[PDB]
Amino acid sequence: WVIP
Amino acid sequence: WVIP
Amino acid sequence: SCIQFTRHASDVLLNLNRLRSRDILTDVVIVVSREQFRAHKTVLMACSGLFYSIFTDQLKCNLSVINLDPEINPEGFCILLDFMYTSRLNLREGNIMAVMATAMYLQMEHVVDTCRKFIKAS
Amino acid sequence: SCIQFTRHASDVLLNLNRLRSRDILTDVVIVVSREQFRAHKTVLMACSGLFYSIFTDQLKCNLSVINLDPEINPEGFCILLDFMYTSRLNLREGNIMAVMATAMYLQMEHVVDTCRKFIKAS
């Protein structure tokens, strides 16, 4: 999971 | 396009 | 010896979400309490262990309406349906419990994992 | 303020390809000369300007069989159908002309672009  |  | 187009999967999902927003080729309504959500069975199956099981069933595969368990929160479902079609999860303090419970029911293991991680941190 | 699961789009496409290989929820047959290819209309639309136009047509959207132009090569179509469901293109010296011609007909602009580049190099 990432910060888009 | 890439070499997978 | 194939070549690969890096953005292909993302572009496919973006176009499937555009079809969803325009209600094109949607073939099922998911009923969550008083709320109705139109979707593509194949996308639901690709994202959820629960929908995968439902639509591979020789009888349920032909249903145009699926009613979820009355404990399922419509907002939690909406957030998860958006994630299915975009890869983006609107996880917030006020919805995390409903999102985790809905993801556990829908069998969306990667969402359950991030919810468990975010809850543990707080 | 969403979070994003990097592998989600690829995982969705991988599961849609698994449904295709097992002939699950396929809703159309594409006829190319004597050859038949089963697929999901939504995936075809998401990948091809031609299928997008066909299945948004109020009459053609309901057809279970689509016959392609007799000039279309079944192998070129097969290679492109595989690319739609995997992001992987089996581009070879012996098939590049048939693949480019089929991609131009199917309106798959990124495939046409790499074929034009690979032809120019040789």
Ligand SMILES: O=C1Cc2cc(Nc3cc(Cl)ncc3Cl)ccc2N1
């Ligand atoms: O967390 C999850 C997400 C998920 C998706 C699917 N859907 C498929 C799985 C396979 Cl192997 N082939 C085809 C499909 Cl559509 C099943 C279980 C789960 N669990």
Ligand SMILES: O=C1Cc2cc(Nc3cc(Cl)ncc3Cl)ccc2N1
């Ligand atoms: O090279 C290409 C690939 C492609 C895909 C699609 N399919 C869509 C486009 C839009 Cl805006 N919304 C929804 C869909 Cl399914 C149309 C044209 C082309 N050209």
Ligand SMILES: [Cl-]
């Ligand atoms: Cl997931």
Ligand SMILES: [Cl-]
């Ligand atoms: Cl393309």
